[PDB]
Design a binder for this molecule. Structure first.
Ligand code: UDP
Ligand code: UDP
Ligand code: UDP
Ligand code: UDP
Ligand code: MN
Ligand code: MN
Ligand code: MN
Ligand code: MN
Lengths: 318, 318, 318, 318
């Protein structure tokens, strides 16, 4: 777990129509950062805000002895794209991500900085006081189950964006080819050592959440497609089940009619429907056959590392 | 909006079986360009013309003190491919695109040059006197709706090829991997600042329009495929609707028959048809599942920028 | 048509289980090449022959003052792959391709060399005395129709491998990414100027043709897939036709039953079948929608030139 | 078959939850390697073992005068990925692969080393005493049939991982783009000369086999997808068969009804079902049409060599 000590830190905050909370956010974040006794930097990214957020950001950047860098984008690209834009400019050894709605307490930064200074590459967080509602709860349960099945371990909370990373992870991720990503998952791919911290949560003080239904469906699709290619494998299973059922039912119908003779007027249509079901299952099998190669192409185009080494131990003589 | 002043301009005109209009076009364009009081250049591209257009082009290029460069292609590749070929040779700071049928008045060039000299990267145009016909009007309405939904702003008129660009945009676009493109849309992807101008329109004086039905369907397909990958997402919605309807209808049939007893001779076939509809919906869901990964692969292969920066504002101390 | 004069020539002959014809082939080819009065070279490629062809090839290469180079492959890759292997070693300015079964008269080489020396990049050939049989004739007719529709001109005869190319074409083709190709078509993509020559044809003197039914189906698939992506567009047309027919038939059934009342006992099943046909057509439309993006990806991965320039004509002052 | 003599050898052993067999394995492998009278090296790779295997590996590496290198991975990637990780560090001229369960006798190493020293690039092995059970036997029969059909020769036994390779093969394979591979097959792609050796087999002394049902299905899929793209071609054949059958049956029904008049009450539904079957076959044809291009894209993205040269024989004068 040994690592070089941290001497500078950077903070990345995506902003999108959050003029109401920005004034308090700036003061609280500045106080928290100054409480570290460490060199600090702040970067604010405007994801195509329609309100006056950009004006406040530039005004803050123009204040005397200001440590705030303002970055403007020509349109709305998304939260993670803005985070990548922020990463492209950071100069500190440790990177902190934070939300602009102020639901994440800025006062938790020093704990993350300390734990990362112990030597850990990636430090996560878990919301001890987490709202419970059937939709979010079920989604989180299924998503965490899939994540632990795939990665081999559970990360506690994936939806919390209050996290810390070291610069090498940022440099590694920034060179990836894939255009769409989920930063918390993509970070664990290159992490040699990880930990977590409990933190408390609060509701947004002003405005409304920007994640609508479609903007949430897109996020779910991105997450699932970034995790695994497994869904392409269930089509063949479903087709096999349907085909076996149809074939067995047709054979049983033939045997029953031969043994007992005619029974109903609509017997022939039933046999034809059974054959139709068998063909429909064969169609699912074919689609899964296509999906296998499609997934292979996707993985090859992605060009992720084929393996990751945790450490190498040579003897006294190489 | 500050930018370096313009000192040279270049004009690109695709030619394809337009011998009738070329003589007048050359004179009018030369007069318009000379009215600028600016260094000017003209490039004519032959997109595999079958008539004598190439002979007229070479003769014009061979005239004394001629500023016309003639470029010949071994076959018909298309309008935008010819425009790219022209861009590959331009030397001026500002680039002007114009049609050879002379429907676009060459006299509007100085206005575009002046407005671009103000500092704007991309200057468009809008046809104030635009022909109205149900086909074109509906197509334009739907296309503009989709464009404003995707890009976030409307461009006024996409079908008008009388436009201006600065050289950096040309260099950026010329290095893109994609083989098929729509220049007006691809230009806005890299534009930091854009404007528009009203202009008048006229019908072609000679000949007939070269865009047939199939040559228009191909253009529509290219435009839609260059805009977005959304169409791959509607298949799953349609499948979900069909499957839900079929399942509900089958359950209702079972409940009704149990409550009221037999009602019709053809009841079983109705249940079988309901099951068939459910499976057919599942098939659409599977095809959409494939489409998600196909779109991901397409975007990754394209390799467009993940974000574009409008400007960065550091404090007095970096 | 001006070009540098030719001073050396090279000949490429694929060999695959042709020991019977090789002795006569070597003598006739040597005589023909020596009749040119030009520096000449010969390359023989063994495509994994099971007979003693390799032994004869090496023996010929080991003869005193022999101009024959023998190349052996670890397995059977195909005719065009062997031709590419030959191209990878040629040193002459002009390249000649010839078959090993001796159906192509070696005595026609000097005519090709002379015509190429006139300046033409690519010289083809046409079989004046061509066997007629329904299978081959219909296949050639349809293939030539498609080729002339796509490329814009007809090449006369595509199945004749007796052809000539200049070295720059070979170098251009050899750097293409695509693993499967049809050399005659891929050559015309980069040819600035082409011509043809009539030649006579004969049946193979010994052995049997190596192209079986499956080995011919694979060749047809390679040719069609190298030509165009159009076949992916007919699925949507077929689906549209089927859906329109089904919808019209269902509406007509409803109208007729309302106007005239009940007519048959099996009316409901007919309506259900009409709805089923409509959905089946929608499925074809969806598959074509997928095919559009698949073809786009294929073209982008291929990375062929976006345009080819025949010549550029600057004025007296650049 | 001439090749440089071997002076150093390396051994690669994947380890995954095999603490029970590791102590005996280390001693037996050390004795076998020391019996060669040749410079030797050993590399142990931990594929994310949950038991104490890593502790034993590091302890062995820390022993005085130890020739064992221990490599740890952050998670379970697979057997072949671990073998690739081992290959990334080997320094010897010849590479030996061995299993950790000790079913492969380590005493067979010197025979492989000697035969490879004769000059062969790749040396395989065949299990003379092989367990027979319907599942494994049928799978091996079909797999070997497909392998010999594709590659042109049979390898004897593909499931035996006790094999030897020279360093150039390792370097060639290590630069391949494909993320998923089957090492024995991928090795033969670049092998100029290969041989085999009989060896005896034994059951694992401790623990249980780690290859479950799903972990075996994934391996079968990887093997088949690495071999060939043929499965995408059978869909069109099946569709053609179904469509021809349906069309013939419908025509026969029409002819029979016209000749003999009405015969059954359910005649119309039979004709409709025949039409439905024809359309279903057309759907398979379309899916195969898509599969052709998908396979082309897969092969192009893979970027394997278009041909491999066994040897070149120039005359006395080049
Ligand atoms: O398109 C978007 C949506 C959100 N955000 C930012 O992401 C954070 C999450 O805000 P939101 O309230 O939507 O998320 P919630 O906490 O309600 O889940 C905020 O800083 C937003 O400004 C953004 O930059 N772009
Ligand atoms: O394959 C084509 C079709 C058109 N054009 C050029 O594109 C412009 C548009 O001409 P057209 O009359 O077809 O378009 P319209 O103005 O009628 O929409 C003209 O300069 C044509 O010469 C071209 O270069 N290649
Ligand atoms: O897999 C193959 C098949 C053919 N050929 C060569 O291609 C030419 C064509 O021979 P074939 O008689 O099969 O073609 P045909 O003239 O009958 O169409 C001959 O030189 C063959 O040796 C080859 O190199 N590899
Ligand atoms: O995910 C896996 C599965 C197996 N193995 C190793 O591969 C070899 C094969 O072991 P197993 O007993 O599963 O194969 P079997 O010989 O029973 O077919 C052993 O050295 C395992 O440690 C591995 O490294 N990773
Ligand atoms: Mn919020
Ligand atoms: Mn026009
Ligand atoms: Mn022949
Ligand atoms: Mn075992």
């Amino acid at each position: 777990f040994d690592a070089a000590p941290i001497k500078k830190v950077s903070v990345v905050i995506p902003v999108y129509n959050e003029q109401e909370s920005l004034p308090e956010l700036i003061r609280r974040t500045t106080t928290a950062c100054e409480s570290l006794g460490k060199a600090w930097e702040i970067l604010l990214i405007d994801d195509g805000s329609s309100d006056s957020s950009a004006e406040l950001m530039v005004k803050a950047s123009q204040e005397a002895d200001s440590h705030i860098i303002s970055i403007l984008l020509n349109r709305n690209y998304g939260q993670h794209a803005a985070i990548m834009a922020g990463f492209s400019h950071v100069s500190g050894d440790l990177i902190i991500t934070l939300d602009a709605d102020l639901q994440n307490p800025p006062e938790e930064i020093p704990r993350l900085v300390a734990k990362a200074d112990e030597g850990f590459d990636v430090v996560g967080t878990v919301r001890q006081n987490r709202q419970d509602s059937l939709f979010r709860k079920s989604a989180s349960k299924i998503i965490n189950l899939l994540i632990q099945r795939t990665t081999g371990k559970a990360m506690g909370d994936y939806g919390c964006m209050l996290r810390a990373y070291r610069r090498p992870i940022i440099d590694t991720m920034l060179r990836c080819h894939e255009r769409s990503t989920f930063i918390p998952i993509l970070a664990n791919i290159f992490a040699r050592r990880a930990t977590e911290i409990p933190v408390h949560h609060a509701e947004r003080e002003f405005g409304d959440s920007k994640y609508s239904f479609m903007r949430l469906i897109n996020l779910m699709y991105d997450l699932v497609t970034c995790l695994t290619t497994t869904p392409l494998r269930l089509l063949s299973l479903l087709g096999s089940v349907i085909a076996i059922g149809g074939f067995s039912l047709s054979v049983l119908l033939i045997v029953l009619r031969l043994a007992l003779g005619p029974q109903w007027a609509a017997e022939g249509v039933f046999m034809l429907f059974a054959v139709l079901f068998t063909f429909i299952g064969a169609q699912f099998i074919g689609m899964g056959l296509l999906g296998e190669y499609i997934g292979r192409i996707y993985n090859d185009v992605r060009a992720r590392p084929r393996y990751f080494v945790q450490q190498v131990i040579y003897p006294e003589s190489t």
